[PDB]
Amino acid sequence: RKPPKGMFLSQEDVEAVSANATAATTVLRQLDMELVSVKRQIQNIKQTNSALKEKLDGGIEPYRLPEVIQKCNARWTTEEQLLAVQAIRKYGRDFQAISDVIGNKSVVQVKNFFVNYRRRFNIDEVLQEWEAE
Amino acid sequence: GVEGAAFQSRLPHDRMTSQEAACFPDIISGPQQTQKVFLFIRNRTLQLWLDNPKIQLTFEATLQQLEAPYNSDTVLVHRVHSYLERHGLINFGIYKRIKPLPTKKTGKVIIIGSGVSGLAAARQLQSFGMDVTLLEARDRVGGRVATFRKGNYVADLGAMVVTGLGGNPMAVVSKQVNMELAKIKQKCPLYEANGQAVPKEKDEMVEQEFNRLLEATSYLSHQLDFNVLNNKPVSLGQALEVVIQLQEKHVKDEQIEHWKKIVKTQEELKELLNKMVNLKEKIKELHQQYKEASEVKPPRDITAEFLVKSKHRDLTALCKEYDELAETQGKLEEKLQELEANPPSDVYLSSRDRQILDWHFANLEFANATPLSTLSLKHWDQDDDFEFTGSHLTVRNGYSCVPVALAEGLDIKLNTAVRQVRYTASGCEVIAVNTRSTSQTFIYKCDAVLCTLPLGVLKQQPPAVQFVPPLPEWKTSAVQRMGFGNLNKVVLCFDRVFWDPSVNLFGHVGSTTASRGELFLFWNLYKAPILLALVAGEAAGIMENISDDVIVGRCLAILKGIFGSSAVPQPKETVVSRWRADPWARGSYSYVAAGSSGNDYDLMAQPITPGPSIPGAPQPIPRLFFAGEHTIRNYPATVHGALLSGLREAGRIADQFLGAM
Numbered sequence: 001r002k003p004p005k006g007m008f009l010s011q012e013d014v015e016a017v018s019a020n021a022t023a024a025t026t027v028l029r030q031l032d033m034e035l036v037s038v039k040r041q042i043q044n045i046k047q048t049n050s051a052l053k054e055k056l057d058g059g060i061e062p063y064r065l066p067e068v069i070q071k072c073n074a075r076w077t078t079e080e081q082l083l084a085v086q087a088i089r090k091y092g093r094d095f096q097a098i099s100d101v102i103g104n105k106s107v108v109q110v111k112n113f114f115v116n117y118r119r120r121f122n123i124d125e126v127l128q129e130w131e132a133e
Numbered sequence: 134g135v136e137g138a139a140f141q142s143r144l145p146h147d148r149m150t151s152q153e154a155a156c157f158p159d160i161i162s163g164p165q166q167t168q169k170v171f172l173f174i175r176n177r178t179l180q181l182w183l184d185n186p187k188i189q190l191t192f193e194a195t196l197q198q199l200e201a202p203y204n205s206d207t208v209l210v211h212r213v214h215s216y217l218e219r220h221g222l223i224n225f226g227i228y229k230r231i232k233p234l235p236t237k238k239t240g241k242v243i244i245i246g247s248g249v250s251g252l253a254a255a256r257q258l259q260s261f262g263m264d265v266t267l268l269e270a271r272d273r274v275g276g277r278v279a280t281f282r283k284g285n286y287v288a289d290l291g292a293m294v295v296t297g298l299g300g301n302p303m304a305v306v307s308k309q310v311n312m313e314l315a316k317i318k319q320k321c322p323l324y325e326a327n328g329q330a331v332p333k334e335k336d337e338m339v340e341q342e343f344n345r346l347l348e349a350t351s352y353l354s355h356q357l358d359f360n361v362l363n364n365k366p367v368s369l370g371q372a373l374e375v376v377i378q379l380q381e382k383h384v385k386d387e388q389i390e391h392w393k394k395i396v397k398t399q400e401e402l403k404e405l406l407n408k409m410v411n412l413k414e415k416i417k418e419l420h421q422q423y424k425e426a427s428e429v430k431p432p433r434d435i436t437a438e439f440l441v442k443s444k445h446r447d448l449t450a451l452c453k454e455y456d457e458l459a460e461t462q463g464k465l466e467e468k469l470q471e472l473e474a475n476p477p478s479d480v481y482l483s484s485r486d487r488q489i490l491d492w493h494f495a496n497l498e499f500a501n502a503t504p505l506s507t508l509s510l511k512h513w514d515q516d517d518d519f520e521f522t523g524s525h526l527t528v529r530n531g532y533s534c535v536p537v538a539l540a541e542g543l544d545i546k547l548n549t550a551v552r553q554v555r556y557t558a559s560g561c562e563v564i565a566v567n568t569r570s571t572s573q574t575f576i577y578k579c580d581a582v583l584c585t586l587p588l589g590v591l592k593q594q595p596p597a598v599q600f601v602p603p604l605p606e607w608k609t610s611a612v613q614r615m616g617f618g619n620l621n622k623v624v625l626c627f628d629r630v631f632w633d634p635s636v637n638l639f640g641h642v643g644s645t646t647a648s649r650g651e652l653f654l655f656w657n658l659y660k661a662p663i664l665l666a667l668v669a670g671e672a673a674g675i676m677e678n679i680s681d682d683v684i685v686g687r688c689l690a691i692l693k694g695i696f697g698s699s700a701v702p703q704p705k706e707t708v709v710s711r712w713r714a715d716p717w718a719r720g721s722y723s724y725v726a727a728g729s730s731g732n733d734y735d736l737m738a739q740p741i742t743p744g745p746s747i748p749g750a751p752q753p754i755p756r757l758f759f760a761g762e763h764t765i766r767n768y769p770a771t772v773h774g775a776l777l778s779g780l781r782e783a784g785r786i787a788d789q790f791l792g793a794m
């Protein structure tokens with residue numbers, strides 16, 4: 001038939017437990033030892049880990065900045081135009097950032113601008129700057 | 134119907150046997166129609182015998198109750214009835230005869246031993262009208278069917294069990310004798326060293342494992358072919374150890390790969406606590422830098438306005454990242470307490486279980502009368518396809534009742550130890566002696582010897598019995614190869630019943646493996662207050678040296694712990710078996726030793742044919758025949774087996790010395 005359920009007996013395993021007089025209690029202690037090793041390796045990486053949890057005690061709560069909820073306008077103020085260029089200068093094409101930076105332009109408007117002005121703000125020349133980084 | 138008598142005579146109702154093909158070759162070689170006629174006639178004649186086996190079934194009586202077109206061919210009905218009669222399928226055991234015994238006898242047979250094998254053959258031969266004389270060394274019949282008797286005390290030191298009546302010859306014998314059969318109540322509570330019962334919980338979940346460990350060996354044997362190990366044949370015991378070890382090995386192997394699957398996790402948590410610390414770092418910086426840059430009170434030029442807004446974004450970015458990494462820190466830290474909460478099995482078997490498993494093994498060593506270290510892994514259970522159906526029973530009034538019944542009216546010389554068996558072209562002489570004055574010598578001349586000497590005796594070195602000429606290598610090699618085991622009994626008689634009287638049997642669990650057999654199991658199944666303690670396993674061997682008293686000691690001790698020191702009297706009288714030391718047994722019964730097979734049981738039954746007296750003379754008749762539990766492949770080491778082995782040789786001897794039927 002097939003080995004009663006749960007009972008385990010590989011071809012290979014039987015060779016191993018017979019092929020000398022006490023290959024029996026070699027293979028058994030081998031594991032008894034190679035076990036307590038892995039248990040001691042856990043103790044390290046559990047204590048190594050409870051230090052790094054000490055070092056995070058605080059979360060980031062003192063360091064978080066209120067959420068400014070802003071009215072995604074279509075007025076390009078000269079103030080906003082400059083913010084934009086400087087963001088392009090430092091973000092490349094991450095239009096998501098460049099929106100978050102200005103704080104009143106949807107990624108649409110940022111991509112709009114990105115071509116409408118484009119030659120007026122030498123945006124090619126500016127983006128080739130974000131290359132040298 | 135009739136079909137049931139075929140099953141009860143151990144025959145297939147729908148097919149002709151090899152035995153039948155040999156005797157009815159015309160029928161079996163020819164038309165399918167006549168086969169079915171034959172088979173009905175056989176099945177019916179059996180049914181007839183069986184439905185009342187206390188009176189001889191004549192050829193006449195058979196033809197009477199037969200139908201047409203079956204009572205058509207009366208030569209065929211005759212041939213069939215005579216075949217069944219010869220081969221001991223009808224008119225066997227203790228029937229009232231109709232036609233009294235042949236006036237004048239034909240042929241002389243000496244039967245060695247009045248065991249059940251012996252007595253069964255004797256009755257057959259005598260009823261076929263031969264001069265039969267049994268030579269028994271003991272002062273009694275029965276051999277390994279012994280009973281103890283004294284007042285109403287009654288306890289088998291020998292066989293005690295009938296293996297259930299579905300195809301059991303003893304079915305018929307029991308109808309022919311005052312044989313009080315009582316089914317065995319299968320409840321058997323265990324009781325560890327101290328005395329405490331075994332919680333039902335456990336008892337089940339070990340026996341479960343025991344059964345599983347066996348199936349395991351059968352797998353290891355058949356599927357993986359694990360049957361030789363560096364030239365020696367593989368023991369069942371060896372296989373059992375190998376399986377158990379591989380079960381300890383897995384238990385560990387699993388633990389290993391669980392704790393291993395923790396570090397994979399606990400060391401992913403580390404690779405993250407790092408990113409999360411080198412971000413509390415990067416975020417510290419960024420906040421300062423934003424604070425410092427928001428210092429610059431407005432109005433400010435657009436570079437300093439950008440630097441503020443730039444940093445603000447940059448820092449809410451890294452505050453996102455750290456929230457998605459303490460997302461992760463949450464899940465991983467649960468996944469860890471999951472693995473911490475359900476760890477695979479600690480051990481394979483508690484040393485308290487390994488002890489209860491040892492009793493389930495002791496029970497197997499009792500059944501087989503040998504250390505499991507000796508049983509053939511491949512063949513230990515070759516008889517298994519032939520077990521009768523029905524619950525096992527016990528003889529309430531002593532099994533002895535059966536041998537004695539059979540012995541009535543036979544020429545039995547008791548206290549006659551056979552010393553030499555000589556067989557030649559021309560006949561045989563058996564030289565025996567009186568057991569009491571050894572020097573008083575007897576000589577029996579006969580056409581045939583039937584040897585029911587026990588395998589133990591056949592094995593004695595140096596020989597108890599000398600064969601002249603000597604048994605051929607093929608026979609002697611079989612005798613060395615087969616196992617003859619051992620198994621003693623302690624008969625404890627008491628003034629009154631201090632045990633559960635609805636309980637047939639209850640185990641004791643030995644401290645260590647090495648003593649698993651030692652009074653491991655107690656039987657109350659006699660009418661008077663009597664307990665039977667088995668010694669099985671390596672123990673049976675050693676207990677024979679230790680003295681009657683010590684044994685009855687270890688024995689009472691064990692009972693006190695289980696029934697309280699108050700209620701355990703000194704025993705009225707005690708007996709201890711010592712079967713290995715009994716020289717008319719040299720042990721208890723046969724086993725399939727590693728490096729044996731069933732085929733050896735067959736060699737043991739093969740009769741010996743002497744060489745010719747004058748060179749260049751015709752091939753003689755065989756002279757030396759063998760029966761007993763060691764000779765019957767399909768029903769070894771039992772009474773029914775012996776019983777059958779006897780019936781068999783009688784037919785083979787009749788066929789030779791009286792011409793076939």
Ligand SMILES: Cc1cc2c(cc1C)N1C=C[C@@H](c3ccccc3)[C@]13C(=O)NC(=O)N=C3N2C[C@H](O)[C@H](O)[C@H](O)COP(=O)(O)OP(=O)(O)OC[C@H]1O[C@@H](n2cnc3c(N)ncnc32)[C@H](O)[C@@H]1O
Nearest residue numbers: 246248249250270276277292293294551717761762772775
């Ligand atoms: C010893 C013993 C046997 C158990 C037995 C317990 C014990 C303690 N039982 C234990 C469990 C049981 C069992 C159940 C199912 C399967 C296996 C086992 C049981 C039992 O409970 N149920 C069962 O059916 N068989 C049992 N058996 C097996 C049967 O008893 C035997 O196979 C059966 O009785 C054999 O009868 P037989 O083959 O004729 O051998 P035996 O020794 O009786 O007769 C030979 C004669 O030779 C005589 N003899 C010797 N040497 C000489 C000489 N040198 N010159 C002259 N004469 C000589 C000898 O004294 C004896 O009278």
Ligand SMILES: O=C(OCC1CCNCC1)N1CCC(F)(CN[C@@H]2C[C@H]2c2ccccc2)CC1
Nearest residue numbers: 294317321500501513514525723724725769770
């Ligand atoms: O009911 C019984 O009580 C024992 C009980 C078993 C259940 N639990 C509580 C104890 N018995 C005992 C003898 C038996 F186990 C069968 N014996 C072996 C198959 C024979 C065999 C094989 C190979 C070579 C020789 C002989 C059946 C009847």
Ligand SMILES: [Cl-]
Nearest residue numbers: 151154155156
């Ligand atoms: Cl033949």
Ligand SMILES: [Cl-]
Nearest residue numbers: 613614615726
């Ligand atoms: Cl041996």
